[PDB]
Amino acid sequence: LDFDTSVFNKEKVSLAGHEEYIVRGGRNLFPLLPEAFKGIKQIGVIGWGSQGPAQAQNLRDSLAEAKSDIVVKIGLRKGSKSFDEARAAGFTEESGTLGDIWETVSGSDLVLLLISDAAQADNYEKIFSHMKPNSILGLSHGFLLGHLQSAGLDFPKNISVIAVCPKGINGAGINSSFAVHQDVDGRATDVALGWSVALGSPFTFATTLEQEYKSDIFGERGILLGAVHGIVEALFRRYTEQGMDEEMAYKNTVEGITGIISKTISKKGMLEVYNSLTEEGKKEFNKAYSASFYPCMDILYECYEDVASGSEIRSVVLAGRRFYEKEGLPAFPMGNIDQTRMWKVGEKVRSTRPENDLGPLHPFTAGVYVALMMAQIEVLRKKGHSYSEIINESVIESVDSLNPFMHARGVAFMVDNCSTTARLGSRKWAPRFDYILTQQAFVTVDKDAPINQDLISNFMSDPVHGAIEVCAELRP
Amino acid sequence: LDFDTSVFNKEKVSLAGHEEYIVRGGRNLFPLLPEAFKGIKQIGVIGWGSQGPAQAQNLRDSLAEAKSDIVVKIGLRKGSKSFDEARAAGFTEESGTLGDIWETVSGSDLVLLLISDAAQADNYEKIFSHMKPNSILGLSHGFLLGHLQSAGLDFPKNISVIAVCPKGLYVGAGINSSFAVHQDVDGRATDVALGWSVALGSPFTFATTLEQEYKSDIFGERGILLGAVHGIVEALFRRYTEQGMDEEMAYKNTVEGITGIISKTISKKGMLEVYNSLTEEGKKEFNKAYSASFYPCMDILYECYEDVASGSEIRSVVLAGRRFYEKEGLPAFPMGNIDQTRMWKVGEKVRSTRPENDLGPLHPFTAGVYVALMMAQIEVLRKKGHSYSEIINESVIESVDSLNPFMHARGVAFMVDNCSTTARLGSRKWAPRFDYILTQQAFVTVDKDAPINQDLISNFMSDPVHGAIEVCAELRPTVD
Numbered sequence: 001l002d003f004d005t006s007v008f009n010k011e012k013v014s015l016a017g018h019e020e021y022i023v024r025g026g027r028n029l030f031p032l033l034p035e036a037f038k039g040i041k042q043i044g045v046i047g048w049g050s051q052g053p054a055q056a057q058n059l060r061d062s063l064a065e066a067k068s069d070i071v072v073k074i075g076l077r078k079g080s081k082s083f084d085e086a087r088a089a090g091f092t093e094e095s096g097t098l099g100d101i102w103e104t105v106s107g108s109d110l111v112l113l114l115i116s117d118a119a120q121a122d123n124y125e126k127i128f129s130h131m132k133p134n135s136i137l138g139l140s141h142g143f144l145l146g147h148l149q150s151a152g153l154d155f156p157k158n159i160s161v162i163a164v165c166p167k168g169i170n171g172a173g174i175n176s177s178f179a180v181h182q183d184v185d186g187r188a189t190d191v192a193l194g195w196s197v198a199l200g201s202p203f204t205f206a207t208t209l210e211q212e213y214k215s216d217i218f219g220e221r222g223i224l225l226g227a228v229h230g231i232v233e234a235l236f237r238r239y240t241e242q243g244m245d246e247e248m249a250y251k252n253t254v255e256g257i258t259g260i261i262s263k264t265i266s267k268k269g270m271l272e273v274y275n276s277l278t279e280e281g282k283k284e285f286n287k288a289y290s291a292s293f294y295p296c297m298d299i300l301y302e303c304y305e306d307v308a309s310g311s312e313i314r315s316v317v318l319a320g321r322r323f324y325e326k327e328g329l330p331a332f333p334m335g336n337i338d339q340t341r342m343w344k345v346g347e348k349v350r351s352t353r354p355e356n357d358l359g360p361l362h363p364f365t366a367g368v369y370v371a372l373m374m375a376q377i378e379v380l381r382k383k384g385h386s387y388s389e390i391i392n393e394s395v396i397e398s399v400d401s402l403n404p405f406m407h408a409r410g411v412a413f414m415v416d417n418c419s420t421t422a423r424l425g426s427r428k429w430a431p432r433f434d435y436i437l438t439q440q441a442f443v444t445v446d447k448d449a450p451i452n453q454d455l456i457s458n459f460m461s462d463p464v465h466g467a468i469e470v471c472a473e474l475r476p
Numbered sequence: 477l478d479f480d481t482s483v484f485n486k487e488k489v490s491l492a493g494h495e496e497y498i499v500r501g502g503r504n505l506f507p508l509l510p511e512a513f514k515g516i517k518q519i520g521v522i523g524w525g526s527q528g529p530a531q532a533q534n535l536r537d538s539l540a541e542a543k544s545d546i547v548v549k550i551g552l553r554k555g556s557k558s559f560d561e562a563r564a565a566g567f568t569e570e571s572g573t574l575g576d577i578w579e580t581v582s583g584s585d586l587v588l589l590l591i592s593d594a595a596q597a598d599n600y601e602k603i604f605s606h607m608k609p610n611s612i613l614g615l616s617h618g619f620l621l622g623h624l625q626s627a628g629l630d631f632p633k634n635i636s637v638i639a640v641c642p643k644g645l646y647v648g649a650g651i652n653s654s655f656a657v658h659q660d661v662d663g664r665a666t667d668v669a670l671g672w673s674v675a676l677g678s679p680f681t682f683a684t685t686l687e688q689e690y691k692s693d694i695f696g697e698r699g700i701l702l703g704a705v706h707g708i709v710e711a712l713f714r715r716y717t718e719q720g721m722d723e724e725m726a727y728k729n730t731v732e733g734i735t736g737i738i739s740k741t742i743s744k745k746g747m748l749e750v751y752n753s754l755t756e757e758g759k760k761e762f763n764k765a766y767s768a769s770f771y772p773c774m775d776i777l778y779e780c781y782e783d784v785a786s787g788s789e790i791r792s793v794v795l796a797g798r799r800f801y802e803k804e805g806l807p808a809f810p811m812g813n814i815d816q817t818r819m820w821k822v823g824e825k826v827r828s829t830r831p832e833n834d835l836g837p838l839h840p841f842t843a844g845v846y847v848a849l850m851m852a853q854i855e856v857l858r859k860k861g862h863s864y865s866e867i868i869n870e871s872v873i874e875s876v877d878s879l880n881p882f883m884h885a886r887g888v889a890f891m892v893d894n895c896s897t898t899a900r901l902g903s904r905k906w907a908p909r910f911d912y913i914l915t916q917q918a919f920v921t922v923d924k925d926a927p928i929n930q931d932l933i934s935n936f937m938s939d940p941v942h943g944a945i946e947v948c949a950e951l952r953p954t955v956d
């Protein structure tokens with residue numbers, strides 16, 4: 001994946017022998033922003049949720065630093081309860097920095113669409129109709145493209161389409177991936193890079209908008225949320241079936257994965273989880289890995305293709321409309337996932353858990369979790385994704401961002417604090433991982449099947465372990 | 477839903493105050509087949525498998541009884557084992573009744589496409605290209621319509637498209653069918669479809685649309701027929717055993733009860749009779765389970781139905797079948813075993829001791845969850861616009877009289893994996909969802925001693941479907 005920026009220097013990084021170009025950020029580059037934002041006199045930031053504040057705030061702040069005349073204006077829908085906070089952050093109508101969504105769309109040369117996935121699906125026509133011809137549409141995530149492609153549609157051909165997507169003391173910040181879907185004049189690459197740099201992205205990786213939404217929507221159904229919830233439920237049931245006390249069962253699954261296993265991967269990667277077990281523990285690890293890799297891949301492979309085909313995005317869109325009454329049927333908002341046995345048990349463990357506790361490192365649990373991680377990697381790898389995307393979505397974000405939430409307060413605190421699309425995916429696919437492990441992986445172990453040494457060998461020697469090291473040095 | 481038939485006589489049936497039109501079959505009508513099939517000199521049955529043999533043989537016999545000169549020719553690929561099975565049934569190239577699929581299609585006036593869903597999705601373009609102008613394409617299931625619609629496509633404009641779909645004895649005997657006319661380019665389509673159904677031996681033929689057929693069918697196997705029943709027995713077995721119940725008593729109180737006494741009860745006197753047969757304390761428990769499980773079940777059924785109707789689910793099935801083989805550097809992932817887990821190992825032991833004719837225990841809590849699931853499926857299909865005859869065949873009769881007896885005999889795998897690939901995939905995809913929603917929501921509502929939605933219960937007791945079901949049971953083949 002190449003790109004062409006006339007403003008910024010791109011640097012090469014090598015990952016498992018695969019060269020990726022990246023662009024480093026820095027407040028020292030803010031002087032370069034007016035060059036990057038050529039032709040833009042207004043940036044409209046639509047929506048003020050979790051990204052609205054930070055993005056608008058950062059964009060306005062970095063542009064002032066460069067002494068730019070560019071106006072950062074928020075547009076909010078009629079009925080938004082964020083008008084007040086928008087004013088609190090200095091974005092007001094009298095200053096011309098706040099207004100109605102449509103009015104704001106009409107006047108912006110760059111439209112950053114930060115509204116929810118459901119809002120984008122229900123409003124893309126009106127957004128397109130209000131945008132200036134030849135302006136730029138900016139997305140933090142590629143859901144909309146997937147929605148349009150699921151209907152055989154694309155964006156209007158008169159607008160540029162770019163994406164700056166987040167992946168999560170000199171050098172602080174949050175890395176981003178950027179994509180240029182359409183570029184009507186040749187400014188797209190520089191406006192997306194400037195947008196990333198303006199946000200404080202220490203690193204901006206290159207991707208395609210199609211790969212972003214595929215990797216993102218699939219990743220959250222896999223190890224990030226769906227799969228880890230499924231395998232944790234499967235093992236809790238197995239361990240308790242085998243007589244292990246409920247609390248140690250919880251600690252040997254959730255506490256282990258979200259704590260010591262996560263921290264171990266974060267520091268020294270997957271190979272140091274195995275190397276940290278006793279000799280007897282390595283053997284249990286390999287039994288679990290050898291039995292769990294392909295079952296996990298089964299579901300991951302199925303989930304990826306449903307996301308890439310358009311089936312899953314259509315399902316997400318329709319699921320969202322079922323949250324409200326229609327066609328004479330009841331409303332079915334999302335329910336609670338944390339009121340079952342194992343999470344009521346998990347509530348007891350945490351009440352007396354000491355601070356900075358990391359739980360026991362159960363070799364079997366480790367083998368299952370690492371098998372799932374390696375299976376996700378292989379699926380994305382053979383589906384054509386770059387190592388930066390693969391690692392930054394299958395390893396870093398789960399062990400460094402999401403798993404701490406589970407360790408903190410349980411599955412719901414992790415899942416239901418994510419996007420609606422992610423919350424739906426976790427509920428739809430966690431049961432799938434639970435069943436296949438129980439029906440296949442655990443049957444293989446209970447058959448006393450021998451260890452698949454090809455898998456183990458491939459695990460020990462997988463190039464991704466070395467790429468994960470390089471990528472680790474890229475984190476902020 | 478109405479249709480116009482010149483050859484056959486259409487009969488009216490009242491179901492919960494809703495009129496439907498049915499066509500009575502019978503050997504006595506075979507004299508009418510020559511006129512029903514006017515314009516047809518050759519019927520090409522494409523495919524063997526589970527339907528081909530029967531359809532071909534019955535059509536041949538019926539046409540001979542009618543003294544028709546129409547030829548039934550089987551279309552198959554020479555490389556299939558099915559080629560010799562057709563010869564073993566008296567279908568020979570040497571006699572003009574056996575040939576390659578493509579040559580058979582091209583020479584047929586009525587093309588009966590009985591190949592697998594997956595083969596249909598992979599070969600429809602070439603089937604269309606070989607069909608004669610103004611010929612008739614007949615389907616036994618509307619999967620192909622769903623596949624085309626999921627791509628914004630439809631059938632060719634220059635052919636008629638009909639369906640005769642077994643809701644399944646020809647030696648009341650036979651299997652009832654539903655029929656649909658999707659395209660009718662010359663006005664013969666309705667009579668050929670009814671002639672087709674009558675010639676199969678359908679005692680009664682119900683009216684539907686191709687769209688409603690494939691929606692109700694693909695959704696139904698993911699609901700109570702397979703996916704949901706599996707998911708609820710896994711959830712109920714896990715709850716019972718977690719509460720201290722013996723493993724074998726828990727298998728009996730779930731699988732054996734549902735597929736035995738409960739199924740026989742609903743089959744004989746319907747859903748209200750399962751309630752009436754309970755103790756006054758069991759009636760309480762039943763209402764607790766039903767009140768807590770009706771809406772969680774609707775949740776998943778509603779989601780599954782819209783996935784089937786939108787095209788999402790049919791495309792998922794097409795892609796799943798391609799993952800049965802190695803590609804893109806990834807392994808092949810055929811379907812796995814679903815019956816090697818604890819509760820099905822326990823089921824084997826139960827059956828090794830079971831007397832013959834054992835119907836198992838009638839656990840009131842189990843009954844409430846199962847009747848709630850079946851009423852929730854009924855509600856989704858009703859709200860989505862299906863007829864009562866389709867709803868009852870797909871949500872009540874097929875389960876209790878046809879599929880559940882397979883689970884009773886040898887466990888879930890013997891029931892699930894005897895069905896179509898599309899159905900086997902659906903079961904595995906959706907069984908986990910019904911288990912999780914029951915456990916996360918329905919069971920949580922019970923353990924909170926939540927109040928009983930008395931409106932739900934009163935609605936259950938007074939639902940018009942119970943009367944509709946009694947009329948539909950009187951239409952079942954043989955006596956049952």
Ligand SMILES: O=c1[nH]c2nc(-c3ccccc3)sc2c(=O)n1O
Nearest residue numbers: 168216217220401417418419421422
């Ligand atoms: O859809 C998504 N939602 C989402 N939410 C995240 C989150 C929210 C609150 C606190 C910590 C993390 S991270 C993440 C993500 O990656 N994708 O894709």
Ligand SMILES: O=c1[nH]c2nc(-c3ccccc3)sc2c(=O)n1O
Nearest residue numbers: 644693694697894895896897898899
């Ligand atoms: O796909 C489907 N497959 C299927 N298989 C059935 C069967 C198979 C073997 C033995 C007895 C019954 S019945 C049925 C059905 O209704 N649908 O839709």
Ligand SMILES: [Mg+2]
Nearest residue numbers: 216219220393
């Ligand atoms: Mg993401």
Ligand SMILES: [Mg+2]
Nearest residue numbers: 216217220422
């Ligand atoms: Mg996401």
Ligand SMILES: [Mg+2]
Nearest residue numbers: 693694696697
């Ligand atoms: Mg069926």
Ligand SMILES: [Mg+2]
Nearest residue numbers: 693694697899
């Ligand atoms: Mg079917």
